Design an enzyme around this catalytic site. Structure first.
Site, PDB file in Angstrom:
ATOM      1  N   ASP B  64       6.894  -6.471   1.500  1.00  0.00           N
ATOM      2  CA  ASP B  64       7.774  -6.669   0.357  1.00  0.00           C
ATOM      3  C   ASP B  64       9.225  -6.428   0.744  1.00  0.00           C
ATOM      4  OD1 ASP B  64       5.253  -6.817  -0.671  1.00  0.00           O
ATOM      5  OD2 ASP B  64       5.602  -5.432  -2.341  1.00  0.00           O
ATOM      6  N   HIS B  66      11.783  -6.889  -2.116  1.00  0.00           N
ATOM      7  CA  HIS B  66      12.260  -6.353  -3.394  1.00  0.00           C
ATOM      8  C   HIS B  66      13.775  -6.469  -3.538  1.00  0.00           C
ATOM      9  CE1 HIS B  66       8.609  -4.908  -5.301  1.00  0.00           C
ATOM     10  NE2 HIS B  66       8.212  -4.404  -4.146  1.00  0.00           N
ATOM     11  N   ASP B  92       7.021 -11.026  -3.057  1.00  0.00           N
ATOM     12  CA  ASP B  92       7.885 -10.022  -3.680  1.00  0.00           C
ATOM     13  C   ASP B  92       9.243  -9.952  -2.976  1.00  0.00           C
ATOM     14  OD1 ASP B  92       5.888  -9.526  -5.486  1.00  0.00           O
ATOM     15  OD2 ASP B  92       5.842  -7.356  -5.164  1.00  0.00           O
ATOM     16  N   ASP B  95      13.635  -8.523  -7.270  1.00  0.00           N
ATOM     17  CA  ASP B  95      13.323  -7.425  -8.178  1.00  0.00           C
ATOM     18  C   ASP B  95      14.599  -6.791  -8.717  1.00  0.00           C
ATOM     19  OD1 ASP B  95      11.939  -5.615  -9.687  1.00  0.00           O
ATOM     20  OD2 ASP B  95      11.104  -4.480  -8.006  1.00  0.00           O
ATOM     21  N   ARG B  96      14.772  -5.497  -8.474  1.00  0.00           N
ATOM     22  CA  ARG B  96      15.896  -4.734  -8.995  1.00  0.00           C
ATOM     23  C   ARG B  96      17.161  -5.094  -8.219  1.00  0.00           C
ATOM     24  NH1 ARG B  96      13.216  -0.327 -12.425  1.00  0.00           N
ATOM     25  NH2 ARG B  96      11.310  -1.492 -11.903  1.00  0.00           N
ATOM     26  N   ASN B 124       3.548 -11.340  -6.801  1.00  0.00           N
ATOM     27  CA  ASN B 124       3.443 -11.245  -8.252  1.00  0.00           C
ATOM     28  C   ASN B 124       4.807 -11.193  -8.928  1.00  0.00           C
ATOM     29  OD1 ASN B 124       3.429  -8.331  -7.171  1.00  0.00           O
ATOM     30  ND2 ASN B 124       3.766  -8.028  -9.368  1.00  0.00           N
ATOM     31  N   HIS B 125       5.874 -10.924  -8.173  1.00  0.00           N
ATOM     32  CA  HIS B 125       7.220 -11.001  -8.722  1.00  0.00           C
ATOM     33  C   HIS B 125       7.753 -12.427  -8.759  1.00  0.00           C
ATOM     34  CE1 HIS B 125       8.595  -6.526  -8.238  1.00  0.00           C
ATOM     35  NE2 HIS B 125       7.399  -6.633  -8.787  1.00  0.00           N
ATOM     36  N   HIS B 173      -0.674 -11.548  -0.729  1.00  0.00           N
ATOM     37  CA  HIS B 173       0.157 -10.486  -1.288  1.00  0.00           C
ATOM     38  C   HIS B 173      -0.695  -9.356  -1.859  1.00  0.00           C
ATOM     39  CE1 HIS B 173       3.528  -8.450  -3.072  1.00  0.00           C
ATOM     40  NE2 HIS B 173       3.021  -8.580  -4.285  1.00  0.00           N
ATOM     41  N   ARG B 221      -2.762  -1.189 -13.037  1.00  0.00           N
ATOM     42  CA  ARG B 221      -1.695  -2.064 -13.505  1.00  0.00           C
ATOM     43  C   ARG B 221      -2.059  -2.801 -14.785  1.00  0.00           C
ATOM     44  NH1 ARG B 221       1.645  -3.251  -8.966  1.00  0.00           N
ATOM     45  NH2 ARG B 221       0.791  -2.443  -6.995  1.00  0.00           N
ATOM     46  N   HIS B 248       2.053  -5.551  -1.438  1.00  0.00           N
ATOM     47  CA  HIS B 248       2.000  -5.237  -2.865  1.00  0.00           C
ATOM     48  C   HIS B 248       2.269  -3.767  -3.181  1.00  0.00           C
ATOM     49  CE1 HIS B 248       1.530  -6.139  -6.937  1.00  0.00           C
ATOM     50  NE2 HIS B 248       0.219  -6.059  -7.075  1.00  0.00           N
TER      51      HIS B 248
END
Ligand SMILES: [Cl-]
Ligand SMILES: [Cl-]
Ligand SMILES: [Cl-]
Ligand SMILES: [Mn+2]
Lengths: 285, 298
Positions: B64, B66, B92, B95-96, B124-125, B173, B221, B248
């Protein structure tokens, strides 16, 4: 630590707001991606206009009353659970509370200068207490638990409304949003297109990933340029005549609809919508 | 690919790499048309290649990212900027932070320039909604517009979901699926598609290995399931595989083994989130299918 307008301390592994009063002309303070766990010594930074606490471990909004000139406040991706401590920030024009744990809208009655409100990715369940924000231009409430559109009649200046990924089931409450130009209602439970009579200025309408089954009640949206209706239940090809009045329409999303099972799916759209230059993800030749 | 597009692609990559070693916070501002061009051209490459990639060594497998763009530039320092090395990423990418655009634009730029030597899987992102992920959608409308995010979802819907390295390393992933019995089921998935809330595609991006579970257990989750150690062993013996390579989940040293080193979890984003001080790892696979692990310090 100098004495300039902008101060940028991102990813500095700072865990305490200690010793910042030295700044004499600071206007923008950026404290993104730190270990800040509480808002503290920001009192003497009266000349501050922008404060950025994006992605920190703050649990409570506090000690922000001395910043009477604050215009942009960003406390996104934190551990906030309630809205508070913002009643003194009278000249706030932008508020970012993205990806927190806020449960309700409250304590926003004094922000008469707000043009942008970002409460996305929270635990909000009802649209409340925003009747005083008559200067709001953009309201972002995506990814929440809102069940009904209400308390939006006072926002006559609203131009962009995002309500994606909520628990809505019927479009309503937009009767007074006469200046609305962008509307996003994707990933809800809406089943019928209705309640857009007063929103003629609409240029962007996103109602994808719902349960819509017929295109109606948008003949008057002559300013439509984008229409995202993927992942629905559109079945009648005659419904596209409702969009012939939009002669500036450039993009339509109709994939993963029952209409896409037609062997001539991309041709019938551009024959019924000759102004469109993009069908789904690809462009028209 | 045109030569005028090649020189414009080299300009995008060059501008994205000018901030190498600078302040972890500096951004590269590309025009909206350049970002859209990366989405559309790479989307055609994703669709022209199988949804189940069949790759061959040598290549470096990263976990990942991110949206940590300055840690992505560190990965390319340790392993070598393309085309010095072949890369496979396990999803992934966004993200942030406020650097998820530079992260995905650099990966898509390398995908367009080295389509047979640079590969990206779907995490999944990389979904087409904001039901669970909001950081990337927040970054798009804020530096540009919401429509630019919609163009990314179009590109994300065409990403491959799994890869098999030299018929011995299965890469995805999330992890295994209770509906995965033959590899043809993965090839049977048609694109473009949004990540569903259940099924084979969902578990390939959301499932997790658990130490206290025998068989298939519920995932904390709320999405997909968790699988036990014996489920991995039967999957490797049935399909004649030697290792499952997934991501993940966050692990401290960047990589962690499961089911007696028959599965490995790669995480290439050091110092993820706040104070949890994890490191990043990168598994290299050479021509003889030998796996070495490089570690990046936060
Ligand atoms: Cl394309
Ligand atoms: Cl290549
Ligand atoms: Cl097989
Ligand atoms: Mn993931």
């Amino acid at each position: 630590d100098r004495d300039a307008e902008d101060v940028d301390l991102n990813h500095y592994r700072i865990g305490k707001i200690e010793g910042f009063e030295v700044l004499k002309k600071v206007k923008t303070l950026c404290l993104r991606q730190n270990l800040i766990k509480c808002i503290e010594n920001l009192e003497e930074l009266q000349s501050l206009r922008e404060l950025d606490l994006y992605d920190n471990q703050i649990k409570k909004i506090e000690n922000l009353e001395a910043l009477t000139e604050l215009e942009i406040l960003d406390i996104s991706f934190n551990l906030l659970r309630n809205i508070e401590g913002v009643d003194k920030l009278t000249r706030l024009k932008k508020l970012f509370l993205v990806n927190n744990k806020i449960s309700k809208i409250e304590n926003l009655s004094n922000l008469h200068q707000l043009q942008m409100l970002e409460l996305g990715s929270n635990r909000i369940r009802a649209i409340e207490n925003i009747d005083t924000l008559t200067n709001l231009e953009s309201l972002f409430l995506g990814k929440n638990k809102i069940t009904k559109l209400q308390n939006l009649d006072a926002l006559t200046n609203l131009t962009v409304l995002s309500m994606q990924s909520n628990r809505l089931t019927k479009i309503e409450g937009l009767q007074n949003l006469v200046n609305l130009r962008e509307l996003y209602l994707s990933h809800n439970g809406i089943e019928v297109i209705e309640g857009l009579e007063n929103n003629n200025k609409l240029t962007m309408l996103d109602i994808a990933s719902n349960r819509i089954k017929k295109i109606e009640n948008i003949s008057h949206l002559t300013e439509l340029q984008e229409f995202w209706m993927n992942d629905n239940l559109l079945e009648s090809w005659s419904d596209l005549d409702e969009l012939k009045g939009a002669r500036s329409l450039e993009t339509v999303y109709l994939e993963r609809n029952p209409l896409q099972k037609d062997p001539q799916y991309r041709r019938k759209v551009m024959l019924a919508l000759p102004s469109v230059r993009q069908i789904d993800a690809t462009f028209v030749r | 690919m045109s030569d005028s597009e090649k020189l414009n692609l080299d300009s995008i990559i060059g501008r994205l790499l000018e901030v190498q070693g600078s302040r972890p916070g500096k951004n590269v501002q590309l025009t909206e048309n350049e970002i859209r061009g990366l989405c559309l051209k790479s989307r055609e490459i994703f669709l022209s290649q199988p949804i189940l990639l069949e790759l061959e060594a040598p290549l470096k497998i990263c976990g990942d990212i991110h949206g940590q763009y300055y840690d992505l530039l560190r990965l390319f320092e340790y392993g070598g900027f393309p085309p010095e090395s072949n890369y496979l990423f396990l999803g992934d990418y966004v993200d942030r932070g406020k650097q998820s655009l530079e992260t995905i634009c650099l990966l898509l730029a390398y995908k367009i320039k080295y389509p047979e030597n640079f590969f990206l899987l779907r995490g999944n992102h990389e979904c087409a909604s904001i039901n669970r992920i909001y950081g990337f959608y927040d970054e798009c409308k804020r530096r540009y517009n919401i429509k630019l995010w919609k163009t990314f979802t179009d590109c994300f819907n065409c990403l491959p979901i799994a890869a098999i390295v030299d018929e011995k390393i299965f890469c995805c992933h999330g992890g295994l699926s209770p509906d995965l019995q033959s590899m043809e089921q993965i090839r049977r998935i048609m694109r473009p598609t949004d990540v569903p809330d259940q099924g084979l595609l969902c578990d390939l991006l959301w499932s997790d290995p658990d130490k206290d579970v025998q068989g298939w257990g519920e995932n904390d989750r709320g999405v997909s399931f968790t699988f036990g150690a014996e489920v991995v062993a039967k999957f490797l013996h049935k399909h004649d595989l030697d290792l499952i390579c997934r991501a993940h989940q966050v692990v401290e040293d960047g990589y962690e083994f499961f089911a007696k080193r028959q599965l490995v979890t790669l995480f290439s984003a050091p110092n993820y989130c706040g104070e949890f001080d994890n490191a990043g790892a990168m598994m290299s696979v050479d021509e003889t299918l030998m796996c070495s692990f490089q570690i990046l310090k936060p």
